[PDB]
Design a protein around this nucleic acid. Sequence first.
DNA 1: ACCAAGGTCATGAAT
DNA 2: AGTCATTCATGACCTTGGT
DNA 3: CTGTTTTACGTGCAT
DNA 4: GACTATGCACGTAAAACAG
Lengths: 435, 432, 196, 199
Amino acid sequence: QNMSLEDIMGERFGRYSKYIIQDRALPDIRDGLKPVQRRILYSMNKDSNDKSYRKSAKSVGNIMGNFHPHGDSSIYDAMVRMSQNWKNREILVEMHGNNGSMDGDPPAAMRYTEARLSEIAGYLLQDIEKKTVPFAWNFDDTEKEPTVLPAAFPNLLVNTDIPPHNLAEVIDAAVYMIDHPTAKIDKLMEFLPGPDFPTGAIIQGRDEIKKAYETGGRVVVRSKTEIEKLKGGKEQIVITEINKANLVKKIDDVRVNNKVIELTELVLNYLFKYTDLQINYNFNMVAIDNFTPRQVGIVPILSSYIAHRREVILARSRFDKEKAEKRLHIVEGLIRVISILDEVIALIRASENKADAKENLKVSYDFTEEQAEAIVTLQLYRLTNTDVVVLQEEEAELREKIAMLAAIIGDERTMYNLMKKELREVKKKFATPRL
Amino acid sequence: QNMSLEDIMGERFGRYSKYIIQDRALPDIRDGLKPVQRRILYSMNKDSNDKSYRKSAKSVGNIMGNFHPHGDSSIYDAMVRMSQNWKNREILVEMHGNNGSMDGDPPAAMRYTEARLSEIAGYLLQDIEKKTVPFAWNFDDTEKEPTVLPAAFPNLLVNTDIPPHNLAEVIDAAVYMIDHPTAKIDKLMEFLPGPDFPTGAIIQGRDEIKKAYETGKGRVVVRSEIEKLKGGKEQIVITEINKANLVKKIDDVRVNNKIELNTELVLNYLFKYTDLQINFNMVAIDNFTPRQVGIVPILSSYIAHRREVILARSRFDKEKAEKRLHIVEGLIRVISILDEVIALIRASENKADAKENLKVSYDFTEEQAEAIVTLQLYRLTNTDVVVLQEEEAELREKIAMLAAIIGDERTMYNLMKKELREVKKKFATPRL
Amino acid sequence: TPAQSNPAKNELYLVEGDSAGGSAKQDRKFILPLRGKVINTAKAKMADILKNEEINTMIYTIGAGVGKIIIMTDADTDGAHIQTLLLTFFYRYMRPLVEAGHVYIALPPLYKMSKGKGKKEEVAAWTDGELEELKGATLQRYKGLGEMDQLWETTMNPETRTLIRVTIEDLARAERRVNVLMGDKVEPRRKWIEDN
Amino acid sequence: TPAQSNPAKNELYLVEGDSAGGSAKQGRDRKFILPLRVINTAKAKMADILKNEEINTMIYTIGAGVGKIIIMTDADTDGAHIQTLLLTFFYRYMRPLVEAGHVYIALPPLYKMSKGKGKKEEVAYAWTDGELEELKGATLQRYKGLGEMNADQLWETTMNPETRTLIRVTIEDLARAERRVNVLMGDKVEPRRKWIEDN
DNA sequence: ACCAAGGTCATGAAT
DNA sequence: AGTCATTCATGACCTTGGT
DNA sequence: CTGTTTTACGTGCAT
DNA sequence: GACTATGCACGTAAAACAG
Ligand SMILES: COc1c(N2C[C@@H]3CCCN[C@@H]3C2)c(F)cc2c(=O)c(C(=O)O)cn(C3CC3)c12
Ligand SMILES: COc1c(N2C[C@@H]3CCCN[C@@H]3C2)c(F)cc2c(=O)c(C(=O)O)cn(C3CC3)c12
């Protein structure tokens, strides 16, 4: 039956709804990875990429059939994007084989490029390992996929528009915010005088940025221009997040229309505002926080990312702690077992089955299953239980860490001292100059 | 230094040489898989594809960066090819999502198609598992790649041109050839009266095929309904060619006035000019060297190709047993003195210390000693007290048979029969 | 670009991309693949629209102009924007087409269920509350009009799926369509996602 | 389709496909370039060849006609057929071009060797056969054809011209037009099947 | 040809 | 292995606008 | 308006 | 996400060859 007639007041309300929640495929206030990104950084993980350069086809293919239903070249294309040093500050993936010029260069299909996860790249995916950030389901429902990678390097404001700001300034403020919660935008700009671009050079608008950092405005940006004197007595002033694709001809357009380049310094001033050789910039602070799309600013962003780690660290605590507990307990058990290795090696022979053997360790002990397990899963090697005295030592080794970790659990103040030493750590290793 | 000037009598001899050994990327007299093929059937293996339909991107990607430097769509494209039922007899890969019409249908990129290894597909890759066919190196030098998958189903003459011939007729002859070696082409055509095409219908040329089967070159023939409509008019319409140009080719006859619209001579005109009833070039690579063969060679080498597959699966599986009966043979003994042994393996010293010290109270070997120490306190419940005893004969039987396949030329073929018969039946095809 | 065919029941299925319009052209026309995202009608100029081969090719096939056309998307939330527009493209222009209500928006399958690995045991448009009616076996989930012979489950039984559109529209709804899609001043759209 | 540039040293590098001619146009550490994306000269008709944008675009850039052009392939045995033809395409037509011998066929790298996973330690070799032995504990590569070499690396065959190239045609003569009508172009089949008696 | 509205072009991740 | 149009938003630079 | 040679069209795997 | 030329061989159906 051709049933179910419906209102275009109906159907265009319901379809367009679906499609608009497909506009939370936009950078999160925490990871600052927009899913089509998040997923390519994880699939390059899971598959183990410090190693050699893995082609692409395989790399994208594997991204493209486990975590992303959408296009191939839609996927990979976006990846190339993360390859372009002159697009990000920390390039969250290094490839080789014609990334693509600032000179309008079409990059080559998957068939040619080989890539690999990048240094700073490590960072963000640097603790998925444990039950850190909360992971969700595959679309195929095969593997599981993470909902925002936990993140060392503050990709969010170091990369809706949010311009680069340089690991250097970012973790520096990051520091401050922590030990001092309530902060003014004016004292925190002291650390991040402005956004660093790969092609920084000069950015003008002190009072313009200053307000923008809470309002979430318009700055200014000037070229890398040079003053020097050629031979024979002529002027030599030439050029060293824009695009060199149209500025190459844009220079030579001035000359073609003779309406004003190592051929009057007022003259440079004409091109320096009309030739698009000193355009820029805008800023449109906009992400998704609280699974809900919002404009924020320099204080929110750092604010939520501080909170985002508060719970990463707390997790890496609560977990690693439980893993220890679980270990010290078969250690704590195996030690005991040494005392009566003889008797134990006894009934485990005359016992009966496999599952028969552990049960029968209700007598001459009170050990638990996980206690009993390894006592039976052992192998006649380790019956050389040399740990007679060692295992004793472990009881304190692994009990120390279970003293610390659990201490990170109540210790609000110790906690941040972590998030410091770490953030400082990247500050240094994967630390950047200035621009 | 811009050194090394050379003769175009030189350079055009040396380059063009390289390129011409890139024309042994052509079907082998055995697998009948041309490498760009061989490699996609293996990569779909290794990765485990009876399971669900795995996309493509991943599938081709993985083919395309472990076993094949060349293009993506060059790779996959060829794959689609193996998907087309109306291209092969046994489709050595089943996909889903618009394979492509006989009606000139562009198939969709990797972004859409999902595929999976096919039934008969299994066959060929059905014993790579062991040290069967001899495998070579990756180009990256990462994994290793096989040089001709060993092959159950005679892909070679069931699929340089070689037309379909139907698993049915093929393994049937295959049978004969074995138990009777020297055979005439005339008595063997009794089993394969001709090539079956997916769109068989009618093929004319009895004396033309007959000679071709040894000559490895010739030309056959192939033909494309009679009924009466209402009101009193003629109704004669149509049900390895191509329906892409025969659709318009019919309507070309009408356009130039030179099809259920009444002379039967008329159909005769189209049935020779309209391409509605339009060769063979037996050519592959044998002895790693490109040759023309025929119905006798092909079956001849493929018989020999298995001779050595079976021999391998023998020599190997045999050695795997020997190696097992020996730690069984050992562990049994060990039961006798589980007590004493459970002894010095405590007071012993290290790990490597423990096995050595089993120079005394025994004469076991390393592989003997290993599992005696790799054991786990579970199995110290060595219930096999009496079982292991039984194994000594279980695994010693198979090592009696297998090794017997090694000298028994006659028993050997009786294998290759029961098997080939086996596919004959399971993955067996009707006729056409 | 069309797919061949006496206007006895109209009949004109509108697929998404040559994969769909390819899978379709291969079991029930008494077809024209729309390629990429169509133009947002109220999003540009009339001269604009006449320049767009998607508006053009469309109005070519079947006369009409300004003064059973089934429309087949996928499940993609991407696939909606391609319902969303076309209806606007069938609305702002070609009013009576759906004012009569001859146009209908096809109801693709969601989750197919499988079973026997050789005996074949398939099934079949809401994997939400619907799917419960169907362990031990297997499942799927449909990724959009393409990875689907099967195609005659939405193909060769027309009423077996389709959904008739526009019924008792009226006015004050042209209010929302200049609000939701097309191209407002941004303000309105940001605003309709107060019910989002 | 060209790549920009006073004929002081000629200079015209012929790459294979826009990936190479893209990697090169970026790595122009040495343009004193045009992607070739070719017909077998002796394989068709003169009218034929004039219809082919590959013959056309070629003879366009740089005048000459009928009456340092470096040519950069890959390692692909696929990449030879694209040496093989062009030379014929530089030979049957544009004779003096290589009769003078001004054309040369670039000597790409084979196997690059690596080492430190952070200290960077690269190498180079244009024969991974007998040559490669001159170079455990470290790592290796094998070069898959003019492309996977970044634009920077690309100056290993790019920005030192003589650091690689190979000058061509020297002391040709005749009785060699014999073999080039035999080998490539398009014989009667018989001859070709026949030259692979030395194959 | 002024000074102003309108019109275009561009940028990432999708079809 | 590039070609090509459009969505979706938002801005500065060019095309019309009139007399 | 013939009968001949000649010419382009097609197909899988690559570029 | 479908256009597009070409080589590699080898058949042959459709154009051009003359007076
Ligand atoms: C030229 O853009 C694309 C088109 N077309 C738009 C053109 C203009 C109008 C007439 N149709 C053509 C076809 C298409 F049909 C599919 C894809 C596609 O699948 C894809 C990917 O993710 O794999 C990437 N792109 C591009 C971003 C590279 C596609
Ligand atoms: C249209 O053929 C291709 C071309 N071109 C030939 C065209 C006509 C002449 C003017 N140039 C264009 C470009 C190309 F340049 C690269 C590839 C390619 O990489 C590839 C694959 O293995 O991925 C598959 N194919 C086709 C088999 C699908 C390619």
